[PDB]
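Re: [help] complex structure
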Amino acid sequence: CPRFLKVKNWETEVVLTDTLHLKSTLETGCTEYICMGSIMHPDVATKDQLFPLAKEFIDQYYSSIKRFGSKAHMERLEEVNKEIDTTSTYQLKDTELIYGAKHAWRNASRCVGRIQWSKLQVFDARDCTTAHGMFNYICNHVKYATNKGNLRSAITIFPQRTDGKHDFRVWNSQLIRYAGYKQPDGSTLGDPANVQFTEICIQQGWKPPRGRFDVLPLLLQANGNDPELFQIPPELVLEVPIRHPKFEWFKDLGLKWYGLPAVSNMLLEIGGLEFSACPFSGWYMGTEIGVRDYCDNSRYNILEEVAKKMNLDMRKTSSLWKDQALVEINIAVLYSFQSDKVTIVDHHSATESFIKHMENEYRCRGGCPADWVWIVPPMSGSITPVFHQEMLNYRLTPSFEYQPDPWNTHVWK
Amino acid sequence: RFLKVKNWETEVVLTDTLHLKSTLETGCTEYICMGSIMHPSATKDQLFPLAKEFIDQYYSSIKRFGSKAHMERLEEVNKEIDTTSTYQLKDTELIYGAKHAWRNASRCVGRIQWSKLQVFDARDCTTAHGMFNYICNHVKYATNKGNLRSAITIFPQRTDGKHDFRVWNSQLIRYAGYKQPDGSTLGDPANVQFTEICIQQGWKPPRGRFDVLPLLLQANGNDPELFQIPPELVLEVPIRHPKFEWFKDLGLKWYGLPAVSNMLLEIGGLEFSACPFSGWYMGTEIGVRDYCDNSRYNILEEVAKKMNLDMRKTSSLWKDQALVEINIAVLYSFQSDKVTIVDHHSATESFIKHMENEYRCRGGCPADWVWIVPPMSGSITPVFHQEMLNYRLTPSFEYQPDPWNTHVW
Ligand code: HEM
Ligand code: HEM
Ligand SMILES: CNCc1cc(C#N)cc(OCc2ccc3c(C)cc(N)nc3c2)c1
Ligand SMILES: CNCc1cc(C#N)cc(OCc2ccc3c(C)cc(N)nc3c2)c1
Ligand SMILES: CNCc1cc(C#N)cc(OCc2ccc3c(C)cc(N)nc3c2)c1
Ligand SMILES: C[C@H](O)[C@H](O)[C@H]1CNc2nc(N)[nH]c(=O)c2N1
Ligand SMILES: C[C@H](O)[C@H](O)[C@H]1CNc2nc(N)[nH]c(=O)c2N1
Ligand SMILES: [Zn+2]
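Output below.
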């Protein structure tokens, strides 16, 4: 593995040199003979597995605070060791928890928003014991992060995994999302992405309003127990109705979206410890709602209706009526959020910020893992600076990881 | 092992076995993915095994693997390598090899067409004049009055490296670009360096916005010579818009025939350093990349002004709006002039169909997502949600260094 790897930006001719990749921990899935960079994803750690994972992390932490090789570093290593020796696990100090969380985000190769990585409110919920307790923590998270539209990024971290049979999980994939319902005629009402989860909620007791934008209940599992239902107080759920600055008819589609993107099904991995419930949130890039959430065929799929109202020729694809429609929808989204003073970033701004962030990281850190397939926005790719930017992808730790859906593993009590 | 790729829109799962035949490197490792790097990473001793592998698959493709003819061919090639340090492809092999180079081009969304490829054998060429004759014939055949037909012209293979045939142009047809004293760029900024080389070599530039470059042709390692393609062979399309009558006043145009002339074709260990190949355009190639790149024509501003868009904030999406109109214009103009062109929706759709065909009849299809996904409206095309496996099969087209960094005059 070569000490230096060069990436080039093909628009600016800027060449950057990556050394950070030498700290790569896990595999990517790619080999010498195959690249899997477009694959979406390519009981517990034993004592002997745990030791070097923890030491690697503790060393990295003390190196970060410029106390590497210090008495404090050496003592902490010893304390972590004895703890793993007598309990087969260990507890992170608060400082270490906060550092690990920030760094999992800093290391998230698919995240274009990482320039903000060091500004992350970390909520320590490691004392939580019940789903009601989880509910309380999540509400406080939602309220803090929402901040009346002036969104602040944040993460709440619940107790780490122990034996694997006492996991804490948020069964929701996001804290806030809209229900989808399959109708007997095969049609779908609400968000088609959410049909299975909605179905689980209904089975667990949830009475669905059966509308187009029903906010789902939280489905919360504590200490390996059966998950429990809770309704988020509506006044904590900031929403933005979607209208257009030129098209007066746009509001008549009755679209709206929630302001707070809060992903809740991922696993936070720090120094070998596994945090199976660690909901984190930031603010939206417009395209996430306007291209994917609205215009994906497997989603709300409104390109057609907008095109109709725009009186476009929808007979030939080469009229580009879809492309035209896609733009206007994204314009509506950005305008609607800005009008209501709810934080949102357009894809041009986000991508330019990312390029600057990447350059800075190459300078202060020796690199910045980035997944081009995910970094480039789902519309207008080549007119954003990341399109022409060569990137290196690799997995650093701490990191956020996928985990199986809990209904597939849970032992019902 | 066997690998699965999933389409997340249709849930279709395909199984790849073809990658097990891959012999070349991708540039990645278990620890580092280089999928977005543009270019990552003979002798008798190495030559025969490469030749064998190819001859083997050729005879395999015609259901005659291990035939007397197969064995005879292997023996013939061996002796030919012994007594001359190289070997020559049969016409059949040449045609098979070229089609398969296209077939294996992971970055090409147009590969549904791979077996319709007119192969011009130019291996008897000895001079720049010969090359020019061949290239004019290629262009006239491929253009076909607007009904474009894919073609490749293959010049003699490399011998010792000192006698290479090279087409110095990156494409057969391109517009020049000129560095203006006031710092800017007239014409096409992609071609500033090449243009200067042509000027330095005797070319008299008209200094317009759309000057067709001369061919700069190198034969048998000698210095390159200049030729002007007869204009009646160069099909062009004036760009206008079906709604915006002002669009034609921008005075934009483009050439009908995309013909890449700077890559290397490799077959059975042999290297063809001059092998211009051509197809027809996907609209975005012109309308997004050629016109709207910052390091290219960069006319987004101009079009956005004429649309009376607010260009003060990026969040107005004025660039995106202008981008779609430019691409509508490109498609409309070509279609109106009955010049073959494909939109990115139609193209990506066809590619999905092609992948299904390849998985069925070949056990897979190497594909580079980073390149297959179009440079606009990504996720509203079916390829965006389609998992792809990228791997390198041979025969293949490869990058090679620009000749003005290797040549001694
Ligand atoms: C502050 C504003 C933020 C913006 C604008 C932003 C933007 C994005 C976008 C556009 C994506 C791709 C989303 C998709 O296509 O599904 C993404 C992915 C991701 N983000 Fe960020 N994000 C932000 C905050 C955060 C925070 C606070 C964290 C963690 C602490 C985070 C971690 C991640 C991770 C782990 C992924 C990849 C998930 C996967 O592999 O599926 N982001 N982000
Ligand atoms: C017939 C219609 C064709 C269409 C619509 C088409 C389309 C495309 C497009 C859009 C690209 C991406 C290029 C870029 O954005 O820079 C590409 C790449 C490529 N095409 Fe095709 N193509 C066609 C025919 C052909 C033919 C006839 C050949 C060769 C015999 C070919 C070989 C290649 C190769 C080797 C690349 C990638 C070059 C690289 O690795 O940089 N294509 N094609
Ligand atoms: C003795 N210190 C001065 C020194 C001299 C020379 C010389 N001449 C080369 C040096 O490289 C150090 C180094 C360290 C790590 C490396 C890794 C992980 C990978 C890799 N491919 N190369 C590496 C090279 C250092
Ligand atoms: C379902 N699509 C694949 C997918 C799967 C999983 C999993 N498991 C998680 C995914 O998270 C993307 C993400 C995560 C956090 C984000 C934050 C904080 C802000 C923001 N604007 N966008 C974000 C996007 C996406
Ligand atoms: C400059 N950008 C990277 C780049 C480098 C090189 C090299 N060396 C060649 C490139 O050609 C891509 C290509 C090749 C053939 C094509 C054909 C036949 C048809 C078509 N519609 N599009 C095509 C696009 C692009
Ligand atoms: C950095 C990146 O790999 C580079 O800009 C690539 C990305 N995808 C592309 N895709 C196509 N079709 N053509 C290109 O030139 C590029 N450029
Ligand atoms: C098949 C492909 O990897 C998949 O659809 C990816 C492509 N790139 C993406 N990029 C982002 N930001 N989000 C996504 O969901 C996807 N989906
Ligand atoms: Zn890879």
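Chain B has ten helices and 18 strands.
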